[PDB]
Design an enzyme around this catalytic site. Structure first.
Site, PDB file in Angstrom:
ATOM      1  N   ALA A 232       0.781  -1.228   0.000  1.00  0.00           N
ATOM      2  CA  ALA A 232       0.000   0.000   0.000  1.00  0.00           C
ATOM      3  C   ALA A 232       0.818   1.286   0.000  1.00  0.00           C
ATOM      4  O   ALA A 232       0.248   2.369  -0.051  1.00  0.00           O
ATOM      5  CB  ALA A 232      -0.940  -0.003   1.188  1.00  0.00           C
ATOM      6  N   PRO A 234       2.841   4.446  -1.239  1.00  0.00           N
ATOM      7  CA  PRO A 234       2.801   5.300  -0.047  1.00  0.00           C
ATOM      8  C   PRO A 234       1.396   5.559   0.506  1.00  0.00           C
ATOM      9  O   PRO A 234       1.263   6.316   1.466  1.00  0.00           O
ATOM     10  CB  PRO A 234       3.412   6.605  -0.551  1.00  0.00           C
ATOM     11  CG  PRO A 234       2.968   6.668  -1.972  1.00  0.00           C
ATOM     12  CD  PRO A 234       2.975   5.242  -2.472  1.00  0.00           C
ATOM     13  N   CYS A 352       3.304  -0.539 -12.601  1.00  0.00           N
ATOM     14  CA  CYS A 352       3.655   0.665 -13.350  1.00  0.00           C
ATOM     15  C   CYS A 352       4.888   0.407 -14.208  1.00  0.00           C
ATOM     16  O   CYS A 352       5.687   1.308 -14.461  1.00  0.00           O
ATOM     17  CB  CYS A 352       3.895   1.848 -12.409  1.00  0.00           C
ATOM     18  SG  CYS A 352       5.249   1.631 -11.237  1.00  0.00           S
TER      19      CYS A 352
END
Length: 441
Positions: A232, A234, A352
């Site tokens: 989780a 930041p 990402c």
């Protein structure tokens, strides 16, 4: 356009190329087009997205109000230049702010300063230059001097990409002085005019790119449900999840690093959420924190990845093994996620990065190893389909969401849809996959 392709170690570039030149893609497009697409891909990673996006904390403020406040702040930052802000039709908690394209007008100065690659990325993101980031500066540089800032993308300073002009807050002597860390070079005329949201409405805003904001919407959490965020840090997607549930329910946030967990608690506190429980816990040991199997309504695996889709990014001084070591960890966390997911629950896998091994191959692996899982369509659909190469049918590929950094040519700086198109296509490298659990285990 103006910046060179992202600076990679030859080995790493060869790895990525190997991944993007599989026989499936070469069969589907030809080798020349595959090569050109890969090269343009490497060429678009160095340049900032045409739009910086922010997520409105709808738990504390309305989108309209924050939009107005941001209009004000923007007409403050740019000396009376007012730029439009657009509320995304599908992601209505997301505001889009246009970045002004390549200024091929700015002519260079005689006094120069050279910064690192990461510092360069920071500058391209809209941050200013601070003294620790400067590795070289012209002699006789005084405070107030109009200087040109270059980025050392190859990291060979004890070759130079022009980032723009600014005024010096320090002298060369002061720069290389013995630790003034809050000052350096104010970027007054950068190539890309992106604004800074580092102290603008701390409780109303969260700096989050479009696909990351899309993740939580795809997850579609509902009030009263139990949600698990395995990785989780930041805390953007966590707080977003809580906000989508109107802070009603329970969002468990997990991270292995203590400091990052404290950051999650800090962000959850700033945005006023209370339904969040953060833990310094290894997500691979989450199953019995730890929690009993099939106890969560929805689970998000925003998995740790090579991150080779981040923009802007001028260089990457990483080893090949570093890049290629993510798959086993991802599969462990994924297994934990599946084990903790309730029957008819929803699992979302997101990265990402742009590699096959960390995206499509993981989807194939998941659909093979877990018969209880079924791939599901996603709403809203903003990014292109999955990339070929991992042995997936067209239907499976059309149910995934992959964002291609080089899908449109690089912009230069309009109507609403003309901006929405740019915000949607000209983005960072990102991957989202959605699963539903059919039976128990």
């Amino acid at each position: 356009s103006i910046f060179p392709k992202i600076s990679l170690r030859p080995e790493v570039e060869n790895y990525l190329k190997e991944g993007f030149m599989n026989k499936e893609i070469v069969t589907a497009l030809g080798k020349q087009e595959a090569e050109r697409k890969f090269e343009t891909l490497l060429k678009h990673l160095s340049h900032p997205p045409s739009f910086t996006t922010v997520r409105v904390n709808t738990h504390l403020a309305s989108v309209q109000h924050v939009k107005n406040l941001l209009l004000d702040e923007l007409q403050k930052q740019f000396n009376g230049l007012s730029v439009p802000i657009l509320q995304h039709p599908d992601l209505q908690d997301v505001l889009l702010i246009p970045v002004i394209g390549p200024r091929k007008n700015i002519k260079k100065q005689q006094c120069e300063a050279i910064v690192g690659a990461q510092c360069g990325n920071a500058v391209l993101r809209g941050a200013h230059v601070y003294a620790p980031g400067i590795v070289s500066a012209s002699q006789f540089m005084k405070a107030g001097d109009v200087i040109s800032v270059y980025s050392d993308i190859k990291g060979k300073c004890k070759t130079k990409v022009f980032l723009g002009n600014g005024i010096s807050e320090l002298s060369r002597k002061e720069i290389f002085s013995g630790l003034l860390k809050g000052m350096g070079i104010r970027m007054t005329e950068p190539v890309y005019l992106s604004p800074s949201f580092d102290s603008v409405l701390p409780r109303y805003l969260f700096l989050q790119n479009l696909p990351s904001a899309l993740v939580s919407h795809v997850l579609n959490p509902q009030p009263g449900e139990k949600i698990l965020d395995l990785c989780a840090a930041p805390g953007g997607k966590t707080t977003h999840i809580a906000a989508l549930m109107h802070d009603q329910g329970e969002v468990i946030a997990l991270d292995k690093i203590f400091n990052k967990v404290e950051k999650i608690k800090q962000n959850a506190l700033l945005l006023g959420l209370n339904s969040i429980r953060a833990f310094c816990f290894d997500g691979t040991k989450a199953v019995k924190p730890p929690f009993l199997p099939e106890s969560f309504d929805r689970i998000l695996l925003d998995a740790p990845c090579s991150g080779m889709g981040q923009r802007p990014n001028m260089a990457c001084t990483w080893s090949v093994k570093e890049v290629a070591s993510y798959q086993p960890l991802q599969r462990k966390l994924f297994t934990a996620a599946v084990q903790l997911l309730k029957p008819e629950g929803v699992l979302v896998y997101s990265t990402c990065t742009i590699t096959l091994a960390e995206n499509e191959e993981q989807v194939a692996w998941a659909l093979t190893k877990f018969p209880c899982l079924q791939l599901q369509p996603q709403e809203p659909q903003i990014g292109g389909e999955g990339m070929r190469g991992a042995g997936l049918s067209c239907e499976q590929l059309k149910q995934l969401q992959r964002f291609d950094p080089s899908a449109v040519p690089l912009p230069d700086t309009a109507r609403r849809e003309d901006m929405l198109r740019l915000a949607n296509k000209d983005s960072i490298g990102f991957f989202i996959a959605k699963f539903v659990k059919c039976k128990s285990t």
